[PDB]
């Protein structure tokens, strides 16, 4: 169909976060066999392989921001690949990896659809600047490069000269905030970005939150929706093998309801699955649950309803 027409982009990338091991994100998810789990239902599955990311040894850092240039080269390569696969009319499934990849993901998606919107599901806002950071890790700084309102507030980071800020403060909705920096919360209150922390989800319920989210983004104008997802926004009871484990996250049922409502919009146009670290699994059972969680999220993004799904023909024959 128009929905569940998939270009698969694997990015075995880790250089925007400290703990190496999310390079085996697409490796484990492909050996979890997301492709075959799509191929039952009417999915136009087409992988495009993994991207060859060069290793620049002289990736000289910024003041606090470390590894700018290899990350910028990675996201520029990924922006080309995402724009390429969205020329195909597919839905850009990109998965890594960490949030630094989402820069080029949203970039190449905005090259095709400049009118997009972002649902950034994450424990964090990841809205840090090079100035307002504490770690300098670019997986904590993807969003600030992509916001038009932080133009001039973004320093000239080596490797991100190609980056064009493509969305506005109204173009993005956060869901799942429970680990927010004072700089992050100050910027969030500064730009007036619509968000949904764990407080409002516990207040309204996940149905009312998803209702208000789709009313905010698609109630004005039906536009392509780029769900960019972090696994730590779900509770680490389900996803302990994530890079930034923060307790008190969303439930597995809640995330499945989110992705089912996104599929029932049908305006999903790009999916980003990051922070998948099998090396942070204390048991392989932890890895197994986390990977199955991410796969089931992706399947419910591409039509796997919990109520059941069938090919529209008679079965009583």
């Amino acid at each position, epitope marked *: 169909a128009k929905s569940r027409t998939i270009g698969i982009i694997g990015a075995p990338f880790s250089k925007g976060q400290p703990r190496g091991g999310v390079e085996e994100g697409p490796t484990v998810l*492909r*050996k*979890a*066999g997301l*492709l*075959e*789990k799509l191929k039952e239902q009417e999915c136009d599955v087409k992988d495009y392989g993994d991207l060859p990311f060069a290793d620049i040894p002289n990736d000289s850092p910024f003041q606090i921001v470390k590894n700018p240039r290899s990350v910028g080269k990675a996201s520029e390569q990924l922006a080309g690949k995402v724009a390429e696969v969205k020329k195909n009319g597919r839905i850009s499934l990109v998965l890594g990896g960490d949030h630094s990849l989402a820069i080029g993901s949203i970039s190449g998606h905005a090259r095709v659809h400049p009118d997009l919107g972002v649902i950034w599901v994450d424990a964090h806002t990841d809205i840090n600047t090079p100035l307002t950071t504490t770690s300098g890790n670019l997986h904590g700084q993807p969003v600030s490069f992509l916001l038009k309102e932080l133009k001039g507030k973004i320093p000239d980071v080596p490797g991100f000269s190609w980056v064009t800020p493509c969305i506005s403060a109204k173009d993005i909705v956060y869901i799942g905030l429970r680990d927010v920096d004072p700089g992050e919360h100050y910027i969030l209150k500064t730009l007036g970005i619509k968000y949904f922390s764990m407080t409002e989800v516990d207040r309204l319920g996940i149905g009312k939150v998803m209702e208000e989210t789709l009313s905010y983004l698609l109630g004005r104008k039906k536009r392509p929706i780029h769900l960019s997802f972090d696994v730590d926004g779900l509770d680490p009871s389900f996803t302990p093998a994530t890079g930034t484990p923060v307790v008190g996250g969303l439930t597995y049922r809640e995330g499945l309801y989110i992705t089912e409502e996104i599929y029932k919009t049908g305006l999903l146009s790009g999916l980003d699955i990051m922070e998948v670290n099998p090396s942070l699994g204390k048991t*392989p*059972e932890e890895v*197994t649950r986390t990977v*199955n969680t991410a796969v089931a999220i992706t399947l419910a993004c591409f039509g796997l309803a919990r109520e059941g799904n069938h090919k529209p023909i008679d079965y009583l024959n």
Partner: antibody
Amino acid sequence: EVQLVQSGAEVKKPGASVKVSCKASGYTFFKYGISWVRQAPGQGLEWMGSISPYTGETHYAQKLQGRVTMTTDTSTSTAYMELRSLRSDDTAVYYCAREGAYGYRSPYQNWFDPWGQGTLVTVSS
Amino acid sequence: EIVMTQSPATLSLSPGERATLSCRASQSVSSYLAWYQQKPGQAPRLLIYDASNRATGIPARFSGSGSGTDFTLTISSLEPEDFAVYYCQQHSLLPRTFGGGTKVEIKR
């Protein structure tokens, strides 16, 4: 046919694992839970673990819980089983076979018929 | 951990009539176990899958009974290519105990 390509016969002294590719062929995956069974030569057989293919449910057997780790590779339907802190008790021909998944949509099997051909592992110093 | 006791330890039979074999369970398996054909130096092969019903290309002579403690395996029409170590093995209880070994010899 419904077949398993095991690979391959290998010994370790007391050391690291002998993770065996149990390459499935002929039959579809994610419907057919694959087990592993050791048998020392001149001895009876010992089932030692069986994953569900998708949503991997481990079900490791007694006396090695623990030392065993089993993984799935459903890109190309091979399966794997390691061992930790290998030992001279592990002089056994390791067979992988398929129980059949005890889910809801998986068809009924109880009887191990993909049969794998065996793998010579003697743990040896 | 239901102990599976095979009542013939070994067997020797110059090729001929019914060479029926036996396996007992420590509990009530209730027709939920299988029969196997571990040939020497070979991979085992399924003979009977659920206490009867003659799995998938077994020739003519390999019935069995049970239901549900002490099970039988009838080698009725011996056919001396069938000299192999045989195995009952419970399945519908974990962990999945095998039998003891049923080395079938020749009884010259």
